[model samples]
Target chain A: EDKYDFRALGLAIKEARKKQGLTREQVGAMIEIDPRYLTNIENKGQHPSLQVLYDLVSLLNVSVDEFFLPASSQVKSTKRRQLENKIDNFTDADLVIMESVADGIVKSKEV
Target chain B: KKEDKYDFRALGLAIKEARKKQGLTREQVGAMIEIDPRYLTNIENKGQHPSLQVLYDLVSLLNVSVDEFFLPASSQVKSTKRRQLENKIDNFTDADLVIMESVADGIVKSKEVGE
Candidate 1:
């Protein structure tokens, strides 16, 4: 499981700003936050107010879902790494049994 | 056009009950959440909204989902948690849903730290 990662949202804010080609000062002005505050949020994982976040997504023409999505997508793919860790815990005999189970599925419609 | 956009009566009551169940005073809760005692009192007794950090702390301390505090918005504010009725909340629009969903996932991860 992923630790509570605030950087995901922060990364989203930074990427959105870059995509729009707008500076942090511009976003700060529109959201009534300081450019410094925006900097902390985008770079330092500071949380923005819900109202400002709503307004930010509106101006950026994106959804709140996007802020969380990239991290989620990354974490989902990391499930592959989870399986690798599981394999590290398995014995050679366990691996052989698991490999045969996988080989059966890959080479045949039924096991 | 939303009405009472920042209403927190239900959240206050739910939090109050949870804290009481934990045998914690408002001051005690505030100390842990890192807010002032009066601020915690205002939140518990008067339903004022706390800052986001404090909100996160309170929920973790109280051992419930962020969805629990949002159990308000019904005609009456009740202290019991009803996970089943959560998704049906009227004001939980798509954007708010995303915000809550994302944050809730973070909380779940936070709780997974020890085991």
Candidate 2:
């Protein structure tokens, strides 16, 4: 099994670039990468540098996990793990504060 | 395409559920994550996928694991095989490995403080 497929990364980059109304040339210029390199990233399965990934995330305006997760299942499991840890650390006073803050935020958002 | 094939839509749903459970609005989450609220709504509706940084922010702010966003709703015989395949795809890249080590260090530091 391939441990990593640059194809997914390529697809994601392509999609994000399109969403931002950017041509390959435009994005390449913005990030100081070559247009051919951006094209390779979007079409020819090129592995991007961490710097490129960071730029993509910033320019594309999405989460890192969205680009990395195999499926949404991992996100759920991560959430569950975090929630369990949070619960373990919660005190009565913490719960009260949380509840009040949460309620207020919810109400404000609803209105 | 497979009818039940996984997609980012599920991630959107998971985010929506988590936000609702926490009583967080898109605006509030947007502020915390430095995203526009309109984009957050688009994410919830599965119109777009979130970026890695946004995912990290959500994980830290919302206290979710990277694994939680990828779990399936129901277990079937094929689910195990699917999970294995997913795991194969999820192994850290060199950069990811570095991030994992950094996270491990943070965890260790927190543990020492009785957290």
lDDT of 1 by residue, A1-111 (tens): 323355666776687688669998888776667888778877887776644554565555443332232323212111222233233433444444444434443455443
TM agreement with the true structure for every prediction: 0.40, 0.33
Best by DockQ: 1
In order, the B-chain TM-scores come to 0.54, 0.52
Best candidate, lDDT? 2
The per-model lDDT (C-alpha) reads 0.52, 0.55
List clashing residue pairs in candidate 1.
none
> Which regions in candidate 2 have their CA more than 4 angstroms from the true location?
A73-111, B1-115
| Global lDDT of model 1 | 0.52
**In model 1, where do residues sit more than 4 Å from their true spots?**
A1-5, A8-43, A50-111, B1-4, B68-115
